[PDB]
Amino acid sequence: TTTAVSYSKSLKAPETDSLNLPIDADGYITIFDGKSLDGWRGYGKDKVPSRWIIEDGCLKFCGTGTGEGQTGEGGDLIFAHKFKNFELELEWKISKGGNSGIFYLAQEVTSKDKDGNEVLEPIYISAPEFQVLDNANHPDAKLGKDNNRQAASLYDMIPAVPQNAKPFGEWNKAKIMVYKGTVVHGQNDENVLEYHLWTKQWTEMLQASKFSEEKWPLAFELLNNCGGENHEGFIGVQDHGDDVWYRNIRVKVLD
Protein backbone atom coordinates (compact mmCIF):
# COMPACT_ATOMS: atom_id res chain seq x y z
CA THR A 1 0.00 0.00 0.00
CA THR A 2 1.39 3.39 -1.27
CA THR A 3 0.17 6.95 -2.05
CA ALA A 4 1.13 9.52 -4.73
CA VAL A 5 3.21 12.27 -3.14
CA SER A 6 3.94 15.34 -5.26
CA TYR A 7 7.41 16.96 -5.03
CA SER A 8 9.41 19.89 -6.55
CA LYS A 9 12.87 19.33 -8.13
CA SER A 10 14.47 22.83 -7.76
CA LEU A 11 14.14 26.34 -6.15
CA LYS A 12 10.42 27.46 -6.18
CA ALA A 13 9.61 24.83 -8.93
CA PRO A 14 5.99 23.45 -9.03
CA GLU A 15 5.29 19.96 -7.63
CA THR A 16 4.99 18.53 -11.22
CA ASP A 17 6.45 15.14 -10.23
CA SER A 18 5.17 12.34 -7.94
CA LEU A 19 6.44 9.37 -5.83
CA ASN A 20 4.60 6.26 -4.71
CA LEU A 21 5.53 6.12 -1.04
CA PRO A 22 4.51 3.55 1.67
CA ILE A 23 1.42 4.56 3.70
CA ASP A 24 0.52 2.48 6.81
CA ALA A 25 -3.02 1.51 8.08
CA ASP A 26 -3.01 4.66 10.32
CA GLY A 27 -2.22 7.07 7.40
CA TYR A 28 1.52 7.68 8.11
CA ILE A 29 3.49 8.14 4.83
CA THR A 30 7.14 7.00 4.93
CA ILE A 31 9.09 9.95 3.45
CA PHE A 32 12.47 8.33 4.47
CA ASP A 33 12.96 4.54 5.05
CA GLY A 34 16.73 4.39 4.40
CA LYS A 35 16.48 3.11 0.82
CA SER A 36 16.67 6.46 -1.13
CA LEU A 37 16.54 10.29 -0.89
CA ASP A 38 13.70 10.55 -3.53
CA GLY A 39 11.67 13.72 -2.95
CA TRP A 40 14.52 15.28 -0.92
CA ARG A 41 16.79 18.10 -2.11
CA GLY A 42 18.85 20.88 -0.62
CA TYR A 43 16.90 23.97 0.48
CA GLY A 44 17.12 26.33 -2.58
CA LYS A 45 19.01 23.61 -4.55
CA ASP A 46 18.18 21.15 -7.42
CA LYS A 47 20.09 18.26 -5.77
CA VAL A 48 20.79 16.56 -2.40
CA PRO A 49 23.96 18.33 -0.99
CA SER A 50 26.98 15.93 -0.99
CA ARG A 51 27.34 16.08 2.84
CA TRP A 52 23.82 14.50 3.28
CA ILE A 53 24.19 10.68 2.80
CA ILE A 54 22.30 7.41 3.43
CA GLU A 55 24.42 5.61 6.09
CA ASP A 56 23.18 2.10 7.28
CA GLY A 57 19.44 2.90 6.70
CA CYS A 58 19.89 6.39 8.27
CA LEU A 59 19.89 9.90 6.84
CA LYS A 60 23.28 11.31 7.93
CA PHE A 61 24.84 14.79 7.80
CA CYS A 62 28.66 14.82 7.63
CA GLY A 63 29.60 18.02 9.41
CA THR A 64 32.82 20.03 9.35
CA GLY A 65 32.19 21.81 12.73
CA THR A 66 31.48 25.31 11.33
CA GLY A 67 28.04 25.76 13.04
CA GLU A 68 25.82 28.24 11.12
CA GLY A 69 28.65 28.76 8.55
CA GLN A 70 27.39 26.16 6.03
CA THR A 71 29.82 24.80 3.38
CA GLY A 72 29.16 24.70 -0.39
CA GLU A 73 28.54 20.92 -0.16
CA GLY A 74 26.29 21.40 2.94
CA GLY A 75 23.12 23.35 3.62
CA ASP A 76 19.72 22.39 5.05
CA LEU A 77 17.80 19.48 3.49
CA ILE A 78 14.05 19.65 2.65
CA PHE A 79 11.47 17.00 1.69
CA ALA A 80 10.18 18.98 -1.30
CA HIS A 81 6.41 18.42 -0.58
CA LYS A 82 4.39 21.28 1.00
CA PHE A 83 2.36 20.15 4.05
CA LYS A 84 -0.39 22.12 5.86
CA ASN A 85 -2.11 20.01 8.58
CA PHE A 86 0.10 17.08 9.44
CA GLU A 87 1.73 14.94 12.12
CA LEU A 88 5.49 14.24 11.70
CA GLU A 89 7.24 11.42 13.60
CA LEU A 90 10.95 10.49 13.44
CA GLU A 91 14.01 9.29 15.37
CA TRP A 92 17.23 11.30 15.67
CA LYS A 93 20.69 10.60 17.08
CA ILE A 94 23.15 13.44 17.80
CA SER A 95 26.96 13.44 17.93
CA LYS A 96 28.73 14.56 21.19
CA GLY A 97 28.49 18.39 21.47
CA GLY A 98 26.25 18.38 18.38
CA ASN A 99 23.48 20.62 17.09
CA SER A 100 20.85 20.16 14.34
CA GLY A 101 17.10 20.73 14.06
CA ILE A 102 13.80 19.99 12.32
CA PHE A 103 12.22 22.77 10.26
CA TYR A 104 8.49 22.82 9.36
CA LEU A 105 6.14 25.05 7.27
CA ALA A 106 9.34 26.24 5.52
CA GLN A 107 9.28 28.49 2.42
CA GLU A 108 12.00 28.89 -0.23
CA VAL A 109 12.55 32.65 0.09
CA THR A 110 14.68 34.86 -2.18
CA SER A 111 15.36 38.61 -1.90
CA LYS A 112 16.80 41.17 -4.41
CA ASP A 113 20.26 42.64 -3.50
CA LYS A 114 21.85 46.10 -4.37
CA ASP A 115 22.74 45.10 -8.02
CA GLY A 116 19.25 43.47 -8.36
CA ASN A 117 20.59 39.87 -8.08
CA GLU A 118 18.42 37.08 -6.55
CA VAL A 119 19.74 36.09 -3.07
CA LEU A 120 18.65 32.92 -1.20
CA GLU A 121 17.37 33.74 2.33
CA PRO A 122 17.85 31.20 5.19
CA ILE A 123 15.25 28.52 5.90
CA TYR A 124 14.97 29.74 9.54
CA ILE A 125 13.59 33.20 8.55
CA SER A 126 10.31 31.47 7.48
CA ALA A 127 10.35 28.11 9.37
CA PRO A 128 9.79 27.33 13.08
CA GLU A 129 12.45 25.01 14.44
CA PHE A 130 12.33 21.93 16.66
CA GLN A 131 15.76 21.99 18.37
CA VAL A 132 18.04 18.85 18.00
CA LEU A 133 20.87 18.99 20.56
CA ASP A 134 23.43 17.38 22.85
CA ASN A 135 21.98 19.18 25.93
CA ALA A 136 24.93 18.14 28.14
CA ASN A 137 27.81 19.38 25.92
CA HIS A 138 26.58 21.97 23.36
CA PRO A 139 26.85 25.60 24.79
CA ASP A 140 23.47 26.57 23.25
CA ALA A 141 21.90 24.43 26.08
CA LYS A 142 22.97 27.23 28.50
CA LEU A 143 21.93 30.17 26.25
CA GLY A 144 18.53 31.82 25.63
CA LYS A 145 15.95 31.80 28.44
CA ASP A 146 14.63 28.95 30.70
CA ASN A 147 16.37 26.23 28.53
CA ASN A 148 14.39 27.27 25.37
CA ARG A 149 17.42 26.25 23.19
CA GLN A 150 17.54 22.60 24.44
CA ALA A 151 16.35 19.51 22.46
CA ALA A 152 12.64 19.59 21.25
CA SER A 153 12.17 23.28 22.18
CA LEU A 154 10.63 25.78 19.77
CA TYR A 155 14.14 27.22 19.24
CA ASP A 156 14.73 30.38 21.40
CA MET A 157 10.92 30.73 22.09
CA ILE A 158 9.40 27.88 24.09
CA PRO A 159 11.27 25.26 26.12
CA ALA A 160 10.50 21.54 26.09
CA VAL A 161 8.89 20.75 29.48
CA PRO A 162 9.77 18.01 30.52
CA GLN A 163 13.32 18.00 29.14
CA ASN A 164 13.43 14.18 28.57
CA ALA A 165 16.11 13.98 25.78
CA LYS A 166 18.34 10.89 25.96
CA PRO A 167 22.16 11.60 25.85
CA PHE A 168 24.33 11.87 22.68
CA GLY A 169 24.62 8.62 20.67
CA GLU A 170 21.16 7.43 21.76
CA TRP A 171 18.02 7.42 19.56
CA ASN A 172 15.42 10.04 20.49
CA LYS A 173 11.82 10.11 19.26
CA ALA A 174 10.51 13.42 17.90
CA LYS A 175 6.95 14.50 17.06
CA ILE A 176 5.68 17.68 15.32
CA MET A 177 1.94 18.13 14.85
CA VAL A 178 0.49 21.12 12.98
CA TYR A 179 -3.35 21.12 13.01
CA LYS A 180 -5.18 24.26 11.94
CA GLY A 181 -2.59 26.47 13.71
CA THR A 182 -2.31 24.29 16.84
CA VAL A 183 1.33 23.15 17.17
CA VAL A 184 2.46 20.35 19.53
CA HIS A 185 6.10 19.20 19.96
CA GLY A 186 6.57 15.66 21.25
CA GLN A 187 9.75 13.94 22.54
CA ASN A 188 10.25 10.30 23.70
CA ASP A 189 6.45 9.57 23.91
CA GLU A 190 5.56 12.83 25.77
CA ASN A 191 4.09 16.20 24.70
CA VAL A 192 6.72 18.82 25.65
CA LEU A 193 5.04 22.08 24.45
CA GLU A 194 2.07 23.54 22.56
CA TYR A 195 1.42 26.91 20.90
CA HIS A 196 -0.85 28.58 18.37
CA LEU A 197 0.17 30.22 15.08
CA TRP A 198 -1.18 33.55 13.65
CA THR A 199 -2.42 34.78 17.07
CA LYS A 200 -1.65 37.89 19.23
CA GLN A 201 0.62 35.65 21.46
CA TRP A 202 2.50 34.33 18.36
CA THR A 203 3.16 37.94 17.19
CA GLU A 204 4.34 39.05 20.70
CA MET A 205 6.63 35.94 20.86
CA LEU A 206 8.18 37.02 17.52
CA GLN A 207 8.59 40.63 18.79
CA ALA A 208 10.70 39.27 21.75
CA SER A 209 12.95 37.16 19.35
CA LYS A 210 15.76 37.67 16.75
CA PHE A 211 13.03 37.85 14.09
CA SER A 212 11.24 40.94 15.53
CA GLU A 213 9.66 43.59 13.22
CA GLU A 214 12.50 46.04 14.10
CA LYS A 215 15.48 43.54 13.83
CA TRP A 216 14.44 41.48 10.76
CA PRO A 217 11.41 42.92 8.81
CA LEU A 218 11.46 40.11 6.17
CA ALA A 219 11.73 37.31 8.82
CA PHE A 220 8.95 39.05 10.81
CA GLU A 221 6.41 39.19 7.93
CA LEU A 222 7.23 35.57 6.89
CA LEU A 223 7.01 34.07 10.43
CA ASN A 224 4.05 36.30 11.49
CA ASN A 225 2.12 34.86 8.50
CA CYS A 226 3.84 31.43 8.94
CA GLY A 227 3.43 29.18 5.88
CA GLY A 228 2.58 32.07 3.54
CA GLU A 229 -0.92 32.77 2.11
CA ASN A 230 -1.72 28.99 2.04
CA HIS A 231 -0.29 28.32 5.60
CA GLU A 232 1.79 25.43 4.21
CA GLY A 233 5.45 24.52 3.81
CA PHE A 234 8.26 22.00 3.82
CA ILE A 235 9.63 19.75 6.54
CA GLY A 236 13.45 20.02 6.57
CA VAL A 237 16.52 19.01 8.66
CA GLN A 238 19.33 21.35 9.63
CA ASP A 239 23.01 21.66 8.63
CA HIS A 240 24.47 23.13 11.85
CA GLY A 241 27.96 21.73 10.99
CA ASP A 242 27.62 18.59 13.18
CA ASP A 243 27.16 14.86 12.51
CA VAL A 244 23.52 13.90 13.03
CA TRP A 245 21.48 10.80 12.10
CA TYR A 246 17.74 10.60 11.26
CA ARG A 247 15.60 7.53 10.58
CA ASN A 248 12.00 6.28 10.16
CA ILE A 249 10.71 9.70 8.92
CA ARG A 250 6.92 9.40 8.54
CA VAL A 251 4.12 12.00 8.03
CA LYS A 252 0.35 11.66 8.45
CA VAL A 253 -1.79 14.24 6.54
CA LEU A 254 -4.46 15.57 8.95
CA ASP A 255 -7.95 16.36 7.64
mmCIF file of C-alpha atoms in Angstrom:
data_model
loop_
_atom_site.group_PDB
_atom_site.id
_atom_site.type_symbol
_atom_site.label_atom_id
_atom_site.label_comp_id
_atom_site.label_asym_id
_atom_site.label_seq_id
_atom_site.Cartn_x
_atom_site.Cartn_y
_atom_site.Cartn_z
ATOM 1 C CA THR A 1 0.000 0.000 0.000
ATOM 2 C CA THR A 2 1.390 3.386 -1.271
ATOM 3 C CA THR A 3 0.172 6.950 -2.045
ATOM 4 C CA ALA A 4 1.133 9.516 -4.727
ATOM 5 C CA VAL A 5 3.208 12.274 -3.142
ATOM 6 C CA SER A 6 3.936 15.337 -5.264
ATOM 7 C CA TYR A 7 7.406 16.959 -5.034
ATOM 8 C CA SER A 8 9.412 19.887 -6.548
ATOM 9 C CA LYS A 9 12.872 19.330 -8.128
ATOM 10 C CA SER A 10 14.467 22.834 -7.764
ATOM 11 C CA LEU A 11 14.145 26.340 -6.148
ATOM 12 C CA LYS A 12 10.422 27.461 -6.183
ATOM 13 C CA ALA A 13 9.608 24.827 -8.931
ATOM 14 C CA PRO A 14 5.985 23.448 -9.027
ATOM 15 C CA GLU A 15 5.289 19.956 -7.627
ATOM 16 C CA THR A 16 4.989 18.528 -11.218
ATOM 17 C CA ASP A 17 6.447 15.136 -10.231
ATOM 18 C CA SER A 18 5.168 12.344 -7.935
ATOM 19 C CA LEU A 19 6.439 9.374 -5.832
ATOM 20 C CA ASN A 20 4.595 6.260 -4.706
ATOM 21 C CA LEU A 21 5.533 6.115 -1.038
ATOM 22 C CA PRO A 22 4.510 3.555 1.666
ATOM 23 C CA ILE A 23 1.421 4.555 3.696
ATOM 24 C CA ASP A 24 0.518 2.482 6.805
ATOM 25 C CA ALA A 25 -3.019 1.508 8.080
ATOM 26 C CA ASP A 26 -3.010 4.657 10.316
ATOM 27 C CA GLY A 27 -2.218 7.067 7.398
ATOM 28 C CA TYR A 28 1.515 7.677 8.105
ATOM 29 C CA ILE A 29 3.486 8.136 4.827
ATOM 30 C CA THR A 30 7.143 6.998 4.927
ATOM 31 C CA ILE A 31 9.091 9.949 3.446
ATOM 32 C CA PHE A 32 12.465 8.330 4.472
ATOM 33 C CA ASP A 33 12.957 4.538 5.050
ATOM 34 C CA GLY A 34 16.729 4.390 4.402
ATOM 35 C CA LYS A 35 16.482 3.105 0.824
ATOM 36 C CA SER A 36 16.668 6.461 -1.128
ATOM 37 C CA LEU A 37 16.541 10.286 -0.890
ATOM 38 C CA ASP A 38 13.700 10.546 -3.532
ATOM 39 C CA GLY A 39 11.665 13.715 -2.955
ATOM 40 C CA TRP A 40 14.524 15.285 -0.918
ATOM 41 C CA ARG A 41 16.786 18.097 -2.112
ATOM 42 C CA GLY A 42 18.852 20.883 -0.619
ATOM 43 C CA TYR A 43 16.900 23.970 0.479
ATOM 44 C CA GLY A 44 17.122 26.326 -2.580
ATOM 45 C CA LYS A 45 19.006 23.609 -4.547
ATOM 46 C CA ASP A 46 18.179 21.145 -7.419
ATOM 47 C CA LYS A 47 20.092 18.257 -5.768
ATOM 48 C CA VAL A 48 20.793 16.564 -2.396
ATOM 49 C CA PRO A 49 23.961 18.328 -0.989
ATOM 50 C CA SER A 50 26.980 15.929 -0.988
ATOM 51 C CA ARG A 51 27.342 16.080 2.837
ATOM 52 C CA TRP A 52 23.821 14.502 3.282
ATOM 53 C CA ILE A 53 24.192 10.679 2.799
ATOM 54 C CA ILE A 54 22.296 7.405 3.435
ATOM 55 C CA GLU A 55 24.420 5.609 6.089
ATOM 56 C CA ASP A 56 23.178 2.104 7.280
ATOM 57 C CA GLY A 57 19.439 2.905 6.697
ATOM 58 C CA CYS A 58 19.890 6.386 8.268
ATOM 59 C CA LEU A 59 19.895 9.904 6.842
ATOM 60 C CA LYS A 60 23.277 11.308 7.934
ATOM 61 C CA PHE A 61 24.838 14.792 7.804
ATOM 62 C CA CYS A 62 28.659 14.815 7.626
ATOM 63 C CA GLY A 63 29.599 18.023 9.414
ATOM 64 C CA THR A 64 32.819 20.031 9.349
ATOM 65 C CA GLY A 65 32.187 21.810 12.725
ATOM 66 C CA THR A 66 31.482 25.314 11.331
ATOM 67 C CA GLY A 67 28.037 25.758 13.039
ATOM 68 C CA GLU A 68 25.825 28.238 11.122
ATOM 69 C CA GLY A 69 28.647 28.756 8.554
ATOM 70 C CA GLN A 70 27.391 26.163 6.028
ATOM 71 C CA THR A 71 29.822 24.800 3.380
ATOM 72 C CA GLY A 72 29.163 24.699 -0.388
ATOM 73 C CA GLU A 73 28.539 20.924 -0.156
ATOM 74 C CA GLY A 74 26.285 21.397 2.935
ATOM 75 C CA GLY A 75 23.118 23.351 3.618
ATOM 76 C CA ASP A 76 19.723 22.389 5.052
ATOM 77 C CA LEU A 77 17.800 19.480 3.492
ATOM 78 C CA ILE A 78 14.053 19.646 2.650
ATOM 79 C CA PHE A 79 11.470 16.995 1.693
ATOM 80 C CA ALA A 80 10.184 18.981 -1.303
ATOM 81 C CA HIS A 81 6.409 18.420 -0.584
ATOM 82 C CA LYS A 82 4.390 21.276 0.996
ATOM 83 C CA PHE A 83 2.360 20.152 4.048
ATOM 84 C CA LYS A 84 -0.387 22.124 5.862
ATOM 85 C CA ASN A 85 -2.111 20.006 8.576
ATOM 86 C CA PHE A 86 0.103 17.079 9.439
ATOM 87 C CA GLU A 87 1.726 14.944 12.116
ATOM 88 C CA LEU A 88 5.491 14.243 11.696
ATOM 89 C CA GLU A 89 7.237 11.418 13.596
ATOM 90 C CA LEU A 90 10.949 10.492 13.436
ATOM 91 C CA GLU A 91 14.009 9.294 15.375
ATOM 92 C CA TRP A 92 17.226 11.304 15.668
ATOM 93 C CA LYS A 93 20.692 10.600 17.075
ATOM 94 C CA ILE A 94 23.151 13.445 17.798
ATOM 95 C CA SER A 95 26.962 13.435 17.934
ATOM 96 C CA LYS A 96 28.727 14.563 21.193
ATOM 97 C CA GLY A 97 28.486 18.395 21.473
ATOM 98 C CA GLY A 98 26.252 18.379 18.384
ATOM 99 C CA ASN A 99 23.482 20.623 17.094
ATOM 100 C CA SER A 100 20.852 20.161 14.343
ATOM 101 C CA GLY A 101 17.096 20.733 14.055
ATOM 102 C CA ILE A 102 13.802 19.991 12.320
ATOM 103 C CA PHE A 103 12.218 22.775 10.256
ATOM 104 C CA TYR A 104 8.487 22.817 9.361
ATOM 105 C CA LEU A 105 6.141 25.055 7.268
ATOM 106 C CA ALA A 106 9.342 26.241 5.520
ATOM 107 C CA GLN A 107 9.285 28.485 2.418
ATOM 108 C CA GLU A 108 12.001 28.891 -0.235
ATOM 109 C CA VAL A 109 12.552 32.652 0.088
ATOM 110 C CA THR A 110 14.684 34.858 -2.183
ATOM 111 C CA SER A 111 15.361 38.609 -1.898
ATOM 112 C CA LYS A 112 16.798 41.166 -4.407
ATOM 113 C CA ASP A 113 20.261 42.638 -3.502
ATOM 114 C CA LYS A 114 21.848 46.100 -4.373
ATOM 115 C CA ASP A 115 22.741 45.101 -8.024
ATOM 116 C CA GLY A 116 19.250 43.466 -8.359
ATOM 117 C CA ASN A 117 20.593 39.873 -8.079
ATOM 118 C CA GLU A 118 18.416 37.076 -6.551
ATOM 119 C CA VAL A 119 19.742 36.090 -3.068
ATOM 120 C CA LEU A 120 18.652 32.924 -1.197
ATOM 121 C CA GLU A 121 17.373 33.744 2.328
ATOM 122 C CA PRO A 122 17.851 31.204 5.192
ATOM 123 C CA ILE A 123 15.246 28.518 5.899
ATOM 124 C CA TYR A 124 14.970 29.740 9.543
ATOM 125 C CA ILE A 125 13.593 33.203 8.546
ATOM 126 C CA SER A 126 10.312 31.472 7.484
ATOM 127 C CA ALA A 127 10.355 28.115 9.370
ATOM 128 C CA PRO A 128 9.788 27.328 13.078
ATOM 129 C CA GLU A 129 12.451 25.013 14.443
ATOM 130 C CA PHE A 130 12.326 21.935 16.661
ATOM 131 C CA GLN A 131 15.757 21.993 18.367
ATOM 132 C CA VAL A 132 18.035 18.849 17.998
ATOM 133 C CA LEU A 133 20.868 18.994 20.563
ATOM 134 C CA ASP A 134 23.426 17.378 22.850
ATOM 135 C CA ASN A 135 21.979 19.180 25.930
ATOM 136 C CA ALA A 136 24.929 18.143 28.139
ATOM 137 C CA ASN A 137 27.808 19.383 25.921
ATOM 138 C CA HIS A 138 26.576 21.972 23.361
ATOM 139 C CA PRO A 139 26.848 25.597 24.787
ATOM 140 C CA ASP A 140 23.471 26.566 23.249
ATOM 141 C CA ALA A 141 21.898 24.428 26.076
ATOM 142 C CA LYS A 142 22.968 27.228 28.501
ATOM 143 C CA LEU A 143 21.926 30.166 26.247
ATOM 144 C CA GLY A 144 18.532 31.818 25.629
ATOM 145 C CA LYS A 145 15.948 31.802 28.441
ATOM 146 C CA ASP A 146 14.635 28.954 30.696
ATOM 147 C CA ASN A 147 16.374 26.230 28.528
ATOM 148 C CA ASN A 148 14.388 27.267 25.372
ATOM 149 C CA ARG A 149 17.424 26.252 23.185
ATOM 150 C CA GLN A 150 17.542 22.604 24.436
ATOM 151 C CA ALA A 151 16.345 19.505 22.456
ATOM 152 C CA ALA A 152 12.635 19.587 21.252
ATOM 153 C CA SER A 153 12.173 23.276 22.180
ATOM 154 C CA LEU A 154 10.631 25.780 19.770
ATOM 155 C CA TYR A 155 14.135 27.218 19.235
ATOM 156 C CA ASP A 156 14.733 30.376 21.405
ATOM 157 C CA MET A 157 10.921 30.730 22.095
ATOM 158 C CA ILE A 158 9.399 27.881 24.088
ATOM 159 C CA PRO A 159 11.269 25.259 26.117
ATOM 160 C CA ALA A 160 10.501 21.538 26.091
ATOM 161 C CA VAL A 161 8.893 20.753 29.479
ATOM 162 C CA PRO A 162 9.766 18.009 30.518
ATOM 163 C CA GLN A 163 13.323 18.001 29.137
ATOM 164 C CA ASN A 164 13.435 14.177 28.574
ATOM 165 C CA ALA A 165 16.106 13.984 25.783
ATOM 166 C CA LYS A 166 18.345 10.888 25.956
ATOM 167 C CA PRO A 167 22.160 11.604 25.855
ATOM 168 C CA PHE A 168 24.333 11.869 22.679
ATOM 169 C CA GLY A 169 24.624 8.617 20.669
ATOM 170 C CA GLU A 170 21.156 7.429 21.758
ATOM 171 C CA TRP A 171 18.015 7.418 19.556
ATOM 172 C CA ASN A 172 15.421 10.040 20.490
ATOM 173 C CA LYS A 173 11.822 10.108 19.259
ATOM 174 C CA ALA A 174 10.505 13.421 17.905
ATOM 175 C CA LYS A 175 6.946 14.502 17.057
ATOM 176 C CA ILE A 176 5.680 17.676 15.316
ATOM 177 C CA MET A 177 1.944 18.131 14.854
ATOM 178 C CA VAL A 178 0.492 21.120 12.977
ATOM 179 C CA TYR A 179 -3.348 21.118 13.015
ATOM 180 C CA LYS A 180 -5.184 24.255 11.936
ATOM 181 C CA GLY A 181 -2.589 26.471 13.706
ATOM 182 C CA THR A 182 -2.314 24.289 16.844
ATOM 183 C CA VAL A 183 1.327 23.154 17.170
ATOM 184 C CA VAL A 184 2.464 20.350 19.535
ATOM 185 C CA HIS A 185 6.098 19.204 19.962
ATOM 186 C CA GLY A 186 6.570 15.658 21.248
ATOM 187 C CA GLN A 187 9.747 13.942 22.538
ATOM 188 C CA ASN A 188 10.254 10.298 23.701
ATOM 189 C CA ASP A 189 6.451 9.574 23.908
ATOM 190 C CA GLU A 190 5.564 12.832 25.768
ATOM 191 C CA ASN A 191 4.094 16.203 24.696
ATOM 192 C CA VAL A 192 6.719 18.818 25.652
ATOM 193 C CA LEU A 193 5.035 22.075 24.448
ATOM 194 C CA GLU A 194 2.074 23.535 22.562
ATOM 195 C CA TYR A 195 1.422 26.909 20.900
ATOM 196 C CA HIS A 196 -0.855 28.585 18.372
ATOM 197 C CA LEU A 197 0.169 30.217 15.084
ATOM 198 C CA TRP A 198 -1.180 33.550 13.649
ATOM 199 C CA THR A 199 -2.419 34.783 17.075
ATOM 200 C CA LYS A 200 -1.651 37.887 19.234
ATOM 201 C CA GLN A 201 0.622 35.651 21.458
ATOM 202 C CA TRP A 202 2.497 34.334 18.364
ATOM 203 C CA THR A 203 3.160 37.941 17.189
ATOM 204 C CA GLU A 204 4.336 39.052 20.698
ATOM 205 C CA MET A 205 6.630 35.938 20.855
ATOM 206 C CA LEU A 206 8.182 37.017 17.521
ATOM 207 C CA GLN A 207 8.591 40.634 18.794
ATOM 208 C CA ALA A 208 10.702 39.269 21.752
ATOM 209 C CA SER A 209 12.953 37.161 19.348
ATOM 210 C CA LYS A 210 15.765 37.666 16.753
ATOM 211 C CA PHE A 211 13.031 37.851 14.087
ATOM 212 C CA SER A 212 11.241 40.937 15.530
ATOM 213 C CA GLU A 213 9.658 43.593 13.223
ATOM 214 C CA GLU A 214 12.502 46.042 14.098
ATOM 215 C CA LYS A 215 15.478 43.542 13.826
ATOM 216 C CA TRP A 216 14.439 41.478 10.756
ATOM 217 C CA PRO A 217 11.406 42.917 8.815
ATOM 218 C CA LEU A 218 11.456 40.105 6.171
ATOM 219 C CA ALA A 219 11.725 37.310 8.823
ATOM 220 C CA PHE A 220 8.948 39.054 10.812
ATOM 221 C CA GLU A 221 6.409 39.189 7.933
ATOM 222 C CA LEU A 222 7.231 35.566 6.890
ATOM 223 C CA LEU A 223 7.010 34.066 10.428
ATOM 224 C CA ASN A 224 4.050 36.296 11.492
ATOM 225 C CA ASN A 225 2.119 34.857 8.496
ATOM 226 C CA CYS A 226 3.841 31.428 8.942
ATOM 227 C CA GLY A 227 3.429 29.175 5.879
ATOM 228 C CA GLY A 228 2.579 32.074 3.540
ATOM 229 C CA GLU A 229 -0.920 32.773 2.114
ATOM 230 C CA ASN A 230 -1.722 28.993 2.038
ATOM 231 C CA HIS A 231 -0.291 28.316 5.602
ATOM 232 C CA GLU A 232 1.792 25.429 4.213
ATOM 233 C CA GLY A 233 5.450 24.522 3.810
ATOM 234 C CA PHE A 234 8.264 22.004 3.823
ATOM 235 C CA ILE A 235 9.629 19.747 6.535
ATOM 236 C CA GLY A 236 13.453 20.016 6.575
ATOM 237 C CA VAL A 237 16.517 19.008 8.656
ATOM 238 C CA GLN A 238 19.333 21.354 9.628
ATOM 239 C CA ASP A 239 23.006 21.656 8.634
ATOM 240 C CA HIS A 240 24.472 23.129 11.855
ATOM 241 C CA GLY A 241 27.961 21.727 10.988
ATOM 242 C CA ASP A 242 27.620 18.592 13.184
ATOM 243 C CA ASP A 243 27.158 14.858 12.510
ATOM 244 C CA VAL A 244 23.519 13.905 13.035
ATOM 245 C CA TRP A 245 21.481 10.803 12.096
ATOM 246 C CA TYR A 246 17.743 10.604 11.261
ATOM 247 C CA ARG A 247 15.598 7.530 10.575
ATOM 248 C CA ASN A 248 11.998 6.281 10.159
ATOM 249 C CA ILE A 249 10.708 9.697 8.917
ATOM 250 C CA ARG A 250 6.924 9.399 8.540
ATOM 251 C CA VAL A 251 4.115 11.996 8.028
ATOM 252 C CA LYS A 252 0.354 11.656 8.447
ATOM 253 C CA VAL A 253 -1.787 14.238 6.545
ATOM 254 C CA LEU A 254 -4.461 15.574 8.953
ATOM 255 C CA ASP A 255 -7.950 16.359 7.641
#
